[PDB]
Amino acid sequence: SVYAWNRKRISNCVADYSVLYNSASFSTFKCYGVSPTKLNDLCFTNVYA
Amino acid sequence: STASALGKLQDVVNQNAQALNTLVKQLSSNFGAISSVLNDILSRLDPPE
């Protein structure tokens, strides 16, 4: 729901964001502090979804 | 025996060293940008922004 948004943690994984980016299933796609195509070289930990 | 009898030369050397040291230390300032490192900020945002 709106006031009870689900929260999940992503860690210890390998993620191919290319298949998510080229996918047209997502109507709108805005990445703020990182370039959309620059997610395949740098990476992080404790991803919050 | 007596020390600190050559204060002027030591002061000149200290002034030069301190000026160089603060010039070197100035590189760690964001200056209003996202980060103070060129390589990492280059690999995060598209060249348009």
Please spell the DSSP secondary structure of A17-45, one letter per residue. Answer: HHHHHH-SS-S----SSS-GGGTTT---S
Documented resolution in Å = 3.2
Count residue pairs from A and B with Cβ separation < 8 A: 17
Looking at residue B26, its amino acid is Q
Whether the CB-CB separation of A48 and A5 falls below 8 Å is answered with no
Helix ranges restricted to H, chain B: 7-25, 38-42
Q: Find all residues with CB under 8 Å of A13, minimum gap 6, and list them.
A: none
Question: Cα dist. A31→B10, B12, B17, B45 in Å?
Answer: 55, 53, 45, 10
Closest-CA distance, B38 to chain A, in angstroms, reads: 14
**Chain B residues near residue A35 by CB distance under 8 angstroms:** 44-46
Q: Do B43 and A42 touch (CB under 8 A)?
A: yes
Whether the CB-CB separation of B46 and A39 falls below 8 Å is answered with no
Q: Side-chain half-sphere of B21: how many Cα atoms within 13 Å? A: 6
Closest-CA distance, B39 to chain A, in angstroms, reads: 11
Method: cryo-EM
Q: Find all residues with CB under 8 Å of A8, minimum gap 6, and list them.
A: A48, A49
Strands (DSSP E) contained in B1-49 are none
